[PDB]
Amino acid sequence: AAPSLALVGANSTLASTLVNYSLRSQNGNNVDYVCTDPDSTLSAPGLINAKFDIKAPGITGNDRIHANLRKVVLDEKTNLPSTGSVTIQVSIPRNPAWNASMTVSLLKQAADYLAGTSATVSGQTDTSGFPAKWAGLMFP
Amino acid sequence: AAPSLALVGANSTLASTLVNYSLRSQNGNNVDYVCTDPDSTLSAPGLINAKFDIKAPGITGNDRIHANLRKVVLDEKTNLPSTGSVTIQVSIPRNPAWNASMTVSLLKQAADYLAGTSATVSGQTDTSGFPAKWAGLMFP
Amino acid sequence: AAPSLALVGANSTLASTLVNYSLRSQNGNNVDYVCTDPDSTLSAPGLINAKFDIKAPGITGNDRIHANLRKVVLDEKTNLPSTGSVTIQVSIPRNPAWNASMTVSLLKQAADYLAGTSATVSGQTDTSGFPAKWAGLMFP
Amino acid sequence: AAPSLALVGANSTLASTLVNYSLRSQNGNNVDYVCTDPDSTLSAPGLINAKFDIKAPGITGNDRIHANLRKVVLDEKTNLPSTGSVTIQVSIPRNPAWNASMTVSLLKQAADYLAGTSATVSGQTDTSGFPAKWAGLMFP
Amino acid sequence: AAPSLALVGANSTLASTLVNYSLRSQNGNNVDYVCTDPDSTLSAPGLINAKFDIKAPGITGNDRIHANLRKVVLDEKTNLPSTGSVTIQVSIPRNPAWNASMTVSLLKQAADYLAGTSATVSGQTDTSGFPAKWAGLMFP
Amino acid sequence: AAPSLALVGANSTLASTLVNYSLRSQNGNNVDYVCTDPDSTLSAPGLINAKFDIKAPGITGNDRIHANLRKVVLDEKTNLPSTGSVTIQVSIPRNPAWNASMTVSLLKQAADYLAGTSATVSGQTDTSGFPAKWAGLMFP
């Protein structure tokens, strides 16, 4: 696994800003990253976690990927922690009628539809405001 | 909800390709889209589902968003369907110490790390190959 | 679904007249419209209903569409309501040997034979009087 | 009944195409047509059925019309037949507060909403794509 | 239902001020709106909800409308939420001895007596101060 | 409580008309008014009721206002009475983070959205027809 990551997120103004993670450890079929920026501390950290559920060899099963991106925040009045999180589950069938291309296509479509980050293509719908609309709990 | 969507995915070459969804049905705080390409048929469809678990206004908890992007595929030999899917759960806390900028930041970071579609920002890790590695059950 | 509809029906003269519906509810792959015209009252309304029985993915079985177009009328003396209704069931198989084109062809033929509204084609039978004959319980 | 019919349906392109039926049987207020085109074979035919449930004279009750438009298709491998069908039930009350005009109005509205074939009237909703959306199991 | 609303309310000085709602979703016989102003957030939102309890066709029953306008507020000391709300229930009989005019008259009278917003008529009582007196828990 | 009221309602034309109430009785935190027009008689009256659910000063909860505006109507054939009513419940929290300006704001918004009687403010939606639509069981 990569020892460190510089991922793109959004500042208070929604401008693209780097967010720096470093690899804490690696267990059985999983990976744990911690945010190394000043705004994350042990009291209120930023975390990323990934895991593989890998089925036995063959074409019968469904492999699974579990990702989890969390940030803890403390109440201004009570310092009580509550966490915000985006969790992802990818399920990849082993029937040879499926492709890594199909996996990647689903990933790209989810990225476009919930984060508005897809590449540029002619007739694409404008998804730049979709993350804002989601964060407001309203459908695009 | 939007009546139709043109989301960006990937073909067998992994080149950026449009994938067209149209609104099947809106239930209360629930939306079902269906793929209108020749790729999906009623027998083996491409589907999207989006749900809102919104707690009572008096109660404090986490509000939740559930998204699911599916593609069904049929076995060549048995025509039995198995499905591949990316599911996403967004948990947003009801504390004013959290805000939509943070929700969007988590969405953007998840997009960068699992789909490799973040906006260009100097010092970002090159996440372009990460969806390929994930589809191979390999940590980036 | 569409928030409002202007469908074509017939007045007392059988002249083509608009009948206006608005989307009152939508729940669980079910859609319910109510008539906004003066002829639909609370006690004796005009109503539309549409349901989807969507089978699990697979190459076997039939998907089903249900639709009901109702007008309630009150008895002159007793004010007891009795309702007149045209209801449609569409059954779409999942064998790839079926087409949306075949579904649409059956819909258009039913429209021609029971409503007399088909498009103009050389050699078509004149179905204009067929809805009148049906309303009289007479085979065309 | 009419000895033959030239109804309008849709080909694989969804272009308006004639579909031809001849009167094969008529018995006991029941009428059965068979499709004369090459696409209807003995093993997988195209068929039409129409029945009258005529109630005894009186001011109470509903008269009923039943109609079924069928196309049979054979499985590529198993040659087992499955059939796709649009079926209509018209229920006409006998309270003099009902009219043949109301029957025809419901028929025309059903044609507009499920087949998209209504006559042209200023302000009507565009129902042209509705049969496609229905065949896809999507509410218009 | 209307996709968005600009309703008149009162600022901290009781001056007429717009309050902007947008349609979140539509379920069975109900409608959910959310305030889109800056002062409403997921932690302390403004909400509007409407529902119809519609009885069967006939003249026997009583139809009902349920409206609910809520605003959540957080304690300056503890950020604990409490909600303020105005709920409305309209009950419309189906006995033809009732009118939509009578429904509207009750609505207008309630508006005049609890909000002081009625139109101008010669001998009307001055109800401008009534909302203030109510908010003080004293009778007009 | 006021000894008498001249509230604005609507006639059969929906023109703004006065409706006159006079104080029948004041109970403790409860008020009953009766319509003094020829429209109301003892057999089929027009009535108003207003109640205050005020919790003990030590206890924190919501204080409540209950208002009810009724018109009784007699069936022409049976002289059986059925009644039509608008009821209002105002729930005001006992947290200083809430105030009378917010109570009044909710009252004004409810008036605008269900009776269409808000004060003129640029950019407001035209709510004038909303009471008509509500009396038709149609969402604005």
Side-chain angles (χ1 to χ4, degrees), chain B residues 39-72:
Chain B
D39 294 330
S40 70
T41 62
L42 292 178
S43 62
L47 297 173
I48 296 173
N49 185 352
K51 295 177 183 178
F52 282 90
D53 186 1
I54 297 168
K55 294 180 72 176
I59 302 170
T60 53
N62 288 318
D63 291 327
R64 290 181 178 181
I65 303 170
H66 298 91
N68 191 356
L69 287 77
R70 297 183 296 276
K71 182 71 174 71
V72 176

mmCIF file of all heavy atoms in Angstrom, chain B residues 39-72:
data_model
loop_
_atom_site.group_PDB
_atom_site.id
_atom_site.type_symbol
_atom_site.label_atom_id
_atom_site.label_comp_id
_atom_site.label_asym_id
_atom_site.label_seq_id
_atom_site.Cartn_x
_atom_site.Cartn_y
_atom_site.Cartn_z
ATOM 1 N N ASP B 39 -26.758 -1.389 -23.364
ATOM 2 C CA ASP B 39 -26.059 -2.242 -22.397
ATOM 3 C C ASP B 39 -27.023 -2.879 -21.410
ATOM 4 O O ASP B 39 -26.877 -4.056 -21.056
ATOM 5 C CB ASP B 39 -25.017 -1.432 -21.627
ATOM 6 C CG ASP B 39 -23.902 -0.937 -22.505
ATOM 7 O OD1 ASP B 39 -23.593 -1.613 -23.510
ATOM 8 O OD2 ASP B 39 -23.343 0.134 -22.190
ATOM 9 N N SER B 40 -27.984 -2.108 -20.916
ATOM 10 C CA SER B 40 -28.965 -2.618 -19.976
ATOM 11 C C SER B 40 -30.236 -3.008 -20.716
ATOM 12 O O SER B 40 -30.667 -2.332 -21.659
ATOM 13 C CB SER B 40 -29.291 -1.601 -18.876
ATOM 14 O OG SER B 40 -30.015 -0.492 -19.373
ATOM 15 N N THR B 41 -30.795 -4.133 -20.305
ATOM 16 C CA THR B 41 -32.110 -4.595 -20.697
ATOM 17 C C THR B 41 -32.888 -4.880 -19.422
ATOM 18 O O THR B 41 -32.329 -4.875 -18.323
ATOM 19 C CB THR B 41 -32.004 -5.846 -21.571
ATOM 20 O OG1 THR B 41 -31.381 -6.895 -20.818
ATOM 21 C CG2 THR B 41 -31.155 -5.548 -22.795
ATOM 22 N N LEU B 42 -34.191 -5.123 -19.561
ATOM 23 C CA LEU B 42 -34.963 -5.490 -18.380
ATOM 24 C C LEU B 42 -34.414 -6.750 -17.733
ATOM 25 O O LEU B 42 -34.429 -6.871 -16.504
ATOM 26 C CB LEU B 42 -36.437 -5.677 -18.732
ATOM 27 C CG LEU B 42 -37.193 -4.411 -19.124
ATOM 28 C CD1 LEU B 42 -38.627 -4.758 -19.489
ATOM 29 C CD2 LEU B 42 -37.142 -3.399 -17.994
ATOM 30 N N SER B 43 -33.900 -7.683 -18.540
ATOM 31 C CA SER B 43 -33.382 -8.934 -17.996
ATOM 32 C C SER B 43 -32.092 -8.711 -17.212
ATOM 33 O O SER B 43 -31.886 -9.326 -16.159
ATOM 34 C CB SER B 43 -33.183 -9.948 -19.128
ATOM 35 O OG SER B 43 -32.234 -9.496 -20.079
ATOM 36 N N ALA B 44 -31.221 -7.826 -17.694
ATOM 37 C CA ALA B 44 -29.949 -7.526 -17.032
ATOM 38 C C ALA B 44 -29.742 -6.019 -17.021
ATOM 39 O O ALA B 44 -29.014 -5.466 -17.856
ATOM 40 C CB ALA B 44 -28.787 -8.237 -17.726
ATOM 41 N N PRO B 45 -30.359 -5.320 -16.071
ATOM 42 C CA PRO B 45 -30.393 -3.857 -16.117
ATOM 43 C C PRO B 45 -29.214 -3.200 -15.417
ATOM 44 O O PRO B 45 -28.478 -3.819 -14.645
ATOM 45 C CB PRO B 45 -31.689 -3.528 -15.366
ATOM 46 C CG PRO B 45 -31.769 -4.608 -14.349
ATOM 47 C CD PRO B 45 -31.226 -5.853 -15.007
ATOM 48 N N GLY B 46 -29.052 -1.916 -15.714
ATOM 49 C CA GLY B 46 -28.213 -1.025 -14.935
ATOM 50 C C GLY B 46 -29.120 -0.087 -14.150
ATOM 51 O O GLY B 46 -30.072 0.463 -14.702
ATOM 52 N N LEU B 47 -28.823 0.065 -12.865
ATOM 53 C CA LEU B 47 -29.782 0.688 -11.962
ATOM 54 C C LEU B 47 -29.082 1.629 -10.996
ATOM 55 O O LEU B 47 -27.913 1.441 -10.658
ATOM 56 C CB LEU B 47 -30.559 -0.373 -11.178
ATOM 57 C CG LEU B 47 -31.425 -1.294 -12.036
ATOM 58 C CD1 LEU B 47 -32.006 -2.406 -11.189
ATOM 59 C CD2 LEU B 47 -32.523 -0.504 -12.736
ATOM 60 N N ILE B 48 -29.816 2.647 -10.548
ATOM 61 C CA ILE B 48 -29.348 3.548 -9.501
ATOM 62 C C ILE B 48 -30.480 3.752 -8.505
ATOM 63 O O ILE B 48 -31.649 3.862 -8.892
ATOM 64 C CB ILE B 48 -28.862 4.901 -10.065
ATOM 65 C CG1 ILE B 48 -27.650 4.704 -10.967
ATOM 66 C CG2 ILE B 48 -28.466 5.843 -8.955
ATOM 67 C CD1 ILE B 48 -27.235 5.961 -11.679
ATOM 68 N N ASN B 49 -30.127 3.792 -7.220
ATOM 69 C CA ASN B 49 -31.069 3.996 -6.128
ATOM 70 C C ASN B 49 -30.472 4.987 -5.138
ATOM 71 O O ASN B 49 -29.289 4.900 -4.809
ATOM 72 C CB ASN B 49 -31.406 2.654 -5.447
ATOM 73 C CG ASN B 49 -32.477 2.778 -4.371
ATOM 74 O OD1 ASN B 49 -32.890 3.875 -3.999
ATOM 75 N ND2 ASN B 49 -32.950 1.636 -3.884
ATOM 76 N N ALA B 50 -31.292 5.935 -4.673
ATOM 77 C CA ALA B 50 -30.847 6.942 -3.711
ATOM 78 C C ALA B 50 -31.919 7.180 -2.658
ATOM 79 O O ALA B 50 -33.070 7.467 -2.995
ATOM 80 C CB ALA B 50 -30.502 8.261 -4.413
ATOM 81 N N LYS B 51 -31.526 7.098 -1.386
ATOM 82 C CA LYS B 51 -32.438 7.137 -0.249
ATOM 83 C C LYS B 51 -31.936 8.138 0.784
ATOM 84 O O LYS B 51 -30.730 8.383 0.900
ATOM 85 C CB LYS B 51 -32.565 5.752 0.418
ATOM 86 C CG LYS B 51 -33.202 4.672 -0.440
ATOM 87 C CD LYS B 51 -33.204 3.328 0.283
ATOM 88 C CE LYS B 51 -33.765 2.215 -0.596
ATOM 89 N NZ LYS B 51 -33.729 0.889 0.089
ATOM 90 N N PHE B 52 -32.875 8.675 1.565
ATOM 91 C CA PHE B 52 -32.594 9.646 2.620
ATOM 92 C C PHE B 52 -33.200 9.167 3.931
ATOM 93 O O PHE B 52 -34.426 9.151 4.085
ATOM 94 C CB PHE B 52 -33.138 11.029 2.265
ATOM 95 C CG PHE B 52 -32.292 11.779 1.296
ATOM 96 C CD1 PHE B 52 -32.499 11.664 -0.055
ATOM 97 C CD2 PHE B 52 -31.263 12.569 1.737
ATOM 98 C CE1 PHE B 52 -31.709 12.348 -0.947
ATOM 99 C CE2 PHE B 52 -30.474 13.247 0.840
ATOM 100 C CZ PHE B 52 -30.701 13.139 -0.500
ATOM 101 N N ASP B 53 -32.339 8.784 4.872
ATOM 102 C CA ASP B 53 -32.738 8.491 6.247
ATOM 103 C C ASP B 53 -32.602 9.786 7.039
ATOM 104 O O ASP B 53 -31.524 10.127 7.534
ATOM 105 C CB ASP B 53 -31.876 7.374 6.827
ATOM 106 C CG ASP B 53 -32.336 6.920 8.201
ATOM 107 O OD1 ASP B 53 -33.345 7.450 8.718
ATOM 108 O OD2 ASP B 53 -31.663 6.033 8.772
ATOM 109 N N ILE B 54 -33.701 10.528 7.143
ATOM 110 C CA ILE B 54 -33.724 11.814 7.828
ATOM 111 C C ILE B 54 -34.465 11.633 9.142
ATOM 112 O O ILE B 54 -35.647 11.269 9.155
ATOM 113 C CB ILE B 54 -34.380 12.905 6.969
ATOM 114 C CG1 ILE B 54 -33.564 13.131 5.699
ATOM 115 C CG2 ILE B 54 -34.492 14.194 7.758
ATOM 116 C CD1 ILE B 54 -34.262 13.968 4.664
ATOM 117 N N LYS B 55 -33.770 11.889 10.245
ATOM 118 C CA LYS B 55 -34.362 11.717 11.557
ATOM 119 C C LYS B 55 -35.304 12.880 11.863
ATOM 120 O O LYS B 55 -35.275 13.926 11.207
ATOM 121 C CB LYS B 55 -33.266 11.597 12.621
ATOM 122 C CG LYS B 55 -32.407 10.334 12.481
ATOM 123 C CD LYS B 55 -31.327 10.253 13.559
ATOM 124 C CE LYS B 55 -31.947 9.936 14.923
ATOM 125 N NZ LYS B 55 -30.969 9.749 16.043
ATOM 126 N N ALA B 56 -36.166 12.672 12.857
ATOM 127 C CA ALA B 56 -37.103 13.705 13.270
ATOM 128 C C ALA B 56 -36.346 14.982 13.637
ATOM 129 O O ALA B 56 -35.225 14.919 14.149
ATOM 130 C CB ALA B 56 -37.930 13.225 14.462
ATOM 131 N N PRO B 57 -36.931 16.156 13.382
ATOM 132 C CA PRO B 57 -36.193 17.405 13.636
ATOM 133 C C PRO B 57 -35.827 17.624 15.096
ATOM 134 O O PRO B 57 -34.788 18.239 15.379
ATOM 135 C CB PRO B 57 -37.155 18.485 13.125
ATOM 136 C CG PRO B 57 -38.500 17.859 13.212
ATOM 137 C CD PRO B 57 -38.299 16.408 12.904
ATOM 138 N N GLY B 58 -36.643 17.145 16.036
ATOM 139 C CA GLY B 58 -36.275 17.266 17.437
ATOM 140 C C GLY B 58 -35.096 16.390 17.816
ATOM 141 O O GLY B 58 -34.210 16.816 18.564
ATOM 142 N N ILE B 59 -35.049 15.165 17.284
ATOM 143 C CA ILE B 59 -34.038 14.178 17.660
ATOM 144 C C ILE B 59 -32.691 14.559 17.056
ATOM 145 O O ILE B 59 -32.607 14.965 15.890
ATOM 146 C CB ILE B 59 -34.468 12.770 17.201
ATOM 147 C CG1 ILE B 59 -35.816 12.386 17.810
ATOM 148 C CG2 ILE B 59 -33.414 11.728 17.574
ATOM 149 C CD1 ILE B 59 -36.400 11.123 17.209
ATOM 150 N N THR B 60 -31.628 14.435 17.852
ATOM 151 C CA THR B 60 -30.265 14.519 17.340
ATOM 152 C C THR B 60 -29.757 13.125 16.998
ATOM 153 O O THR B 60 -29.950 12.175 17.766
ATOM 154 C CB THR B 60 -29.312 15.183 18.338
ATOM 155 O OG1 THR B 60 -29.391 14.520 19.606
ATOM 156 C CG2 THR B 60 -29.614 16.658 18.490
ATOM 157 N N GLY B 61 -29.143 13.011 15.839
ATOM 158 C CA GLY B 61 -28.509 11.781 15.413
ATOM 159 C C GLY B 61 -27.654 12.105 14.218
ATOM 160 O O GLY B 61 -27.135 13.216 14.088
ATOM 161 N N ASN B 62 -27.504 11.128 13.332
ATOM 162 C CA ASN B 62 -26.895 11.352 12.030
ATOM 163 C C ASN B 62 -27.972 11.205 10.965
ATOM 164 O O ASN B 62 -28.763 10.255 10.999
ATOM 165 C CB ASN B 62 -25.747 10.369 11.763
ATOM 166 C CG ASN B 62 -24.500 10.661 12.594
ATOM 167 O OD1 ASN B 62 -24.095 11.806 12.756
ATOM 168 N ND2 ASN B 62 -23.878 9.606 13.109
ATOM 169 N N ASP B 63 -28.026 12.162 10.047
ATOM 170 C CA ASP B 63 -28.786 11.977 8.822
ATOM 171 C C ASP B 63 -27.965 11.121 7.863
ATOM 172 O O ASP B 63 -26.732 11.148 7.885
ATOM 173 C CB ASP B 63 -29.128 13.334 8.204
ATOM 174 C CG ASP B 63 -30.134 14.121 9.036
ATOM 175 O OD1 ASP B 63 -31.006 13.490 9.674
ATOM 176 O OD2 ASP B 63 -30.042 15.369 9.069
ATOM 177 N N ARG B 64 -28.649 10.322 7.040
ATOM 178 C CA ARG B 64 -27.949 9.359 6.199
ATOM 179 C C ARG B 64 -28.425 9.421 4.752
ATOM 180 O O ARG B 64 -29.607 9.643 4.477
ATOM 181 C CB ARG B 64 -28.101 7.931 6.758
ATOM 182 C CG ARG B 64 -27.328 7.753 8.044
ATOM 183 C CD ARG B 64 -27.388 6.368 8.656
ATOM 184 N NE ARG B 64 -26.543 6.371 9.849
ATOM 185 C CZ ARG B 64 -26.329 5.330 10.643
ATOM 186 N NH1 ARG B 64 -26.898 4.162 10.380
ATOM 187 N NH2 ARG B 64 -25.536 5.460 11.702
ATOM 188 N N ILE B 65 -27.481 9.215 3.838
ATOM 189 C CA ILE B 65 -27.737 9.096 2.408
ATOM 190 C C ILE B 65 -27.280 7.711 1.977
ATOM 191 O O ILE B 65 -26.158 7.305 2.302
ATOM 192 C CB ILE B 65 -26.990 10.172 1.601
ATOM 193 C CG1 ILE B 65 -27.367 11.562 2.082
ATOM 194 C CG2 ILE B 65 -27.332 10.051 0.139
ATOM 195 C CD1 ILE B 65 -26.488 12.640 1.506
ATOM 196 N N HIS B 66 -28.140 6.987 1.258
ATOM 197 C CA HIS B 66 -27.806 5.659 0.749
ATOM 198 C C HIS B 66 -27.892 5.677 -0.769
ATOM 199 O O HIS B 66 -28.967 5.904 -1.326
ATOM 200 C CB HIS B 66 -28.743 4.580 1.300
ATOM 201 C CG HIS B 66 -28.686 4.417 2.787
ATOM 202 N ND1 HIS B 66 -29.508 5.117 3.644
ATOM 203 C CD2 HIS B 66 -27.917 3.623 3.571
ATOM 204 C CE1 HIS B 66 -29.246 4.766 4.891
ATOM 205 N NE2 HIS B 66 -28.283 3.862 4.874
ATOM 206 N N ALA B 67 -26.777 5.420 -1.437
ATOM 207 C CA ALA B 67 -26.742 5.363 -2.888
ATOM 208 C C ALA B 67 -26.250 3.996 -3.338
ATOM 209 O O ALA B 67 -25.408 3.374 -2.687
ATOM 210 C CB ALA B 67 -25.849 6.458 -3.472
ATOM 211 N N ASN B 68 -26.780 3.540 -4.467
ATOM 212 C CA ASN B 68 -26.443 2.221 -4.985
ATOM 213 C C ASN B 68 -26.449 2.276 -6.505
ATOM 214 O O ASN B 68 -27.469 2.636 -7.105
ATOM 215 C CB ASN B 68 -27.433 1.177 -4.472
ATOM 216 C CG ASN B 68 -26.984 -0.235 -4.754
ATOM 217 O OD1 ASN B 68 -25.966 -0.454 -5.405
ATOM 218 N ND2 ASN B 68 -27.729 -1.206 -4.240
ATOM 219 N N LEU B 69 -25.320 1.916 -7.116
ATOM 220 C CA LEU B 69 -25.178 1.852 -8.566
ATOM 221 C C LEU B 69 -24.856 0.412 -8.950
ATOM 222 O O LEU B 69 -23.810 -0.118 -8.560
ATOM 223 C CB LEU B 69 -24.085 2.802 -9.062
ATOM 224 C CG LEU B 69 -24.424 4.295 -9.035
ATOM 225 C CD1 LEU B 69 -24.320 4.859 -7.623
ATOM 226 C CD2 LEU B 69 -23.551 5.087 -9.992
ATOM 227 N N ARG B 70 -25.751 -0.211 -9.713
ATOM 228 C CA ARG B 70 -25.716 -1.634 -10.000
ATOM 229 C C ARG B 70 -25.641 -1.872 -11.502
ATOM 230 O O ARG B 70 -26.185 -1.098 -12.299
ATOM 231 C CB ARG B 70 -26.976 -2.330 -9.461
ATOM 232 C CG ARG B 70 -27.147 -2.287 -7.957
ATOM 233 C CD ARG B 70 -28.394 -3.061 -7.506
ATOM 234 N NE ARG B 70 -29.635 -2.467 -8.006
ATOM 235 C CZ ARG B 70 -30.275 -1.461 -7.414
ATOM 236 N NH1 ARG B 70 -29.788 -0.921 -6.307
ATOM 237 N NH2 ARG B 70 -31.398 -0.984 -7.931
ATOM 238 N N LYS B 71 -24.988 -2.972 -11.875
ATOM 239 C CA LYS B 71 -25.080 -3.531 -13.219
ATOM 240 C C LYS B 71 -25.260 -5.035 -13.088
ATOM 241 O O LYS B 71 -24.427 -5.710 -12.474
ATOM 242 C CB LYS B 71 -23.838 -3.213 -14.056
ATOM 243 C CG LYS B 71 -23.897 -3.744 -15.489
ATOM 244 C CD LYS B 71 -24.900 -2.963 -16.327
ATOM 245 C CE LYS B 71 -24.877 -3.376 -17.795
ATOM 246 N NZ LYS B 71 -25.452 -4.735 -18.016
ATOM 247 N N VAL B 72 -26.350 -5.553 -13.645
ATOM 248 C CA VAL B 72 -26.626 -6.985 -13.651
ATOM 249 C C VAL B 72 -26.015 -7.583 -14.905
ATOM 250 O O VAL B 72 -26.034 -6.961 -15.976
ATOM 251 C CB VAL B 72 -28.141 -7.256 -13.594
ATOM 252 C CG1 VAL B 72 -28.426 -8.745 -13.689
ATOM 253 C CG2 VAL B 72 -28.733 -6.686 -12.330
#
